[PDB]
Design a protein around this ligand. Sequence first.
Ligand code: FE2
Length: 818
Amino acid sequence: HKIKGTVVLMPKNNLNAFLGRSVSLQLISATKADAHGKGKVGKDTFLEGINTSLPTLGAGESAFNIHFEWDGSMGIPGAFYIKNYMQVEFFLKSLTLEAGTIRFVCNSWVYNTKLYKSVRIFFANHTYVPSETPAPLVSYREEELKSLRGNGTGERKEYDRIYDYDVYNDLGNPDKSEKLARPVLGGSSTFPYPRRGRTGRGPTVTDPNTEKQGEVFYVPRDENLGHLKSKDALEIGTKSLSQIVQPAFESAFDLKSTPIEFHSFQDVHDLYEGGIKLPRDVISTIIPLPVIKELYRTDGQHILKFPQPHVVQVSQSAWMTDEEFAREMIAGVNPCVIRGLEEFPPKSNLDPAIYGDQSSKITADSLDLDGYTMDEALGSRRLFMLDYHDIFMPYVRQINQLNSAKTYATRTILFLREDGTLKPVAIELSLPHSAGDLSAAVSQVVLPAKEGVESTIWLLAKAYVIVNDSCYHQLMSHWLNTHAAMEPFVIATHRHLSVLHPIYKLLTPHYRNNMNINALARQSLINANGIIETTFLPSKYSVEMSSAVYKNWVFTDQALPADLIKRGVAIKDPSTPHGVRLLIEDYPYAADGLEIWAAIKTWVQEYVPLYYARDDDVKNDSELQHWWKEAVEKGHGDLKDKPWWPKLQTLEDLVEVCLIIIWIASALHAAVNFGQYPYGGLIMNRPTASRRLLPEKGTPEYEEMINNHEKAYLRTITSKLPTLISLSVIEILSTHASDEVYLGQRDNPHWTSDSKALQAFQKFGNKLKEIEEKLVRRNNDPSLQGNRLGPVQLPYTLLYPSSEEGLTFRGIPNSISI
Ligand SMILES: [Fe+2]
């Protein structure tokens, strides 16, 4: 007659105020339906008291007792309605019905009832494909999806839970200045791009195609994760940095209270040793801000001290070695761009009518390949390259027209030595050339050198290459390939897969905080005059460059084996465990990556069969088919005309699509994100911009390379002010919040009632622990020291599955969470 229940919730910041007629719940039957096929609904039941029995209850949570009038004739409850009559919203954690037990995992904000068009509804933790949904819950299931989709119009509000798409037309700020106008990215052949979450603020006054400014960029409510500890709200750091800290830094420079430029490498090392001295009010503006205050140690008066980057913890000069420059292409912050080179000289697909003759000027006989001839090096698969020539050439002219920005389209040739390490053997610095060019600067090839002015020119050549790499890493490897590429799948999932769906349960953990960090990025990171535009080389051309690269983005090539084969760094080999043979045996990112990839694959292959017996069961899943069709045709719609999209009519295709999504969101993003401050915290190792081309002989700039090489280097790379800003942002992005959920973990042990699924997940977690033990053995193997540690003696731990909180250089989160 009465059903004992327990409600756990978190107030928005006492208890007794939740009693009386403040909160009511109504159970919904999953087995007994009304004359309309819908499950019967019980009476409005209010919380009756504060339960304080079980210790297992933390996180500022509170338990409440409640009893429901439910006769056996009403069936078995499978869902419930809830209404909040209080003025302030609260966070609902769960509902548990005892006597067996029926569990409901909610984790959702419930605002005042008058703000909702339909009553909030929650389902029990059972998993069902569409054809398996109990009949009394079928309509409720579809109605909730319709509610989540909205109608495509209106300004979204804080409490809204509406998922929809829009183009990137909210980055420019034309109403403030024509100089801040930016092209709309997405929806055109000129500028294709993944879609982002719709906000609906309306058009600007000067341009109907651009969305007006807003103080808060909306995301569906539960996508905006709250945090028990203020220090864990890392995503709010970019806004404070751009709006509050940046102006404070600028004032210190405008008033000439600190030198405007770094004058020696020691001035840079000072940042994490004794620190930098700044005006009292500048320190007073920073020291009290949440998140920001954790980025620097201070005396509370004039000093800011950055943490010592991992790359200099053993040797502060090792970053300058040719060995470390090449090693970071396979074990650094951006380990996924290097390609095999099977012909020589390297070729270009760009139009010589526009850029001039595109033939490479690197001559084979000038290279030192440890005694090998070029044909021998090519045939033995020992020649590789880091090729940014075709990628940057189209933008060099416009970038070089900017004040304080000068770059080259670079290409680096690498040789795999018999000892298994890579060595750089040539760098080509290319410039476009057309009829009436005003500039007399020309392209050139630079070779390795350890002494004299030649060693300075070679060090500068490496810096021009790393500026290309840093820009490609930040905009493409990181922003486009993880953050931007994933959002369309998050939106499609909430719009078409019910919370009851097995694939929804498989994929959603891998979306945690993604839409939230992306919206904050559109507002302060990739906006006109935002952090990236003001600290990286391309300035106002940064985001559009990523649209150009997107023209060639291929979903199926994001799979690790396919990526390795496409780049020519591995070959298909059925006789091997992973199905591929690596051409660089000790390629840390790839070797550790294949272990994680295989573990995720086994998990997906064991989960899917639990809900789909045959290929026809996949083809006949209505939600699944609608989900995929929209993700492709709308989410990544500008590429819907491509032949490579999987079909999702077989068990094989379903496994493939889920495996790739999970890989991108977890391991791929971790590998390109958590090494940012560890490697880039020393601006000389990862410069974000270059300001001048190589000097002409006979000029004072040339004389400087000879007499003051550190100053020549510093005048070429990112200036001191933008360096302070960029170091601050990458320190934030490289930090693991203490409430992170890692691969092999879930936020709740009752995400599903299915014991088989829970068992398979346990095996997945145990396998990851097994893999970590193996990776530790690899880092401790002296024979692998050259590529896994290098002269910087930094063990490659970026793909270790686990980690404690902080700037740890390890740990794989489930999602793109920062
Ligand atoms: Fe990230």
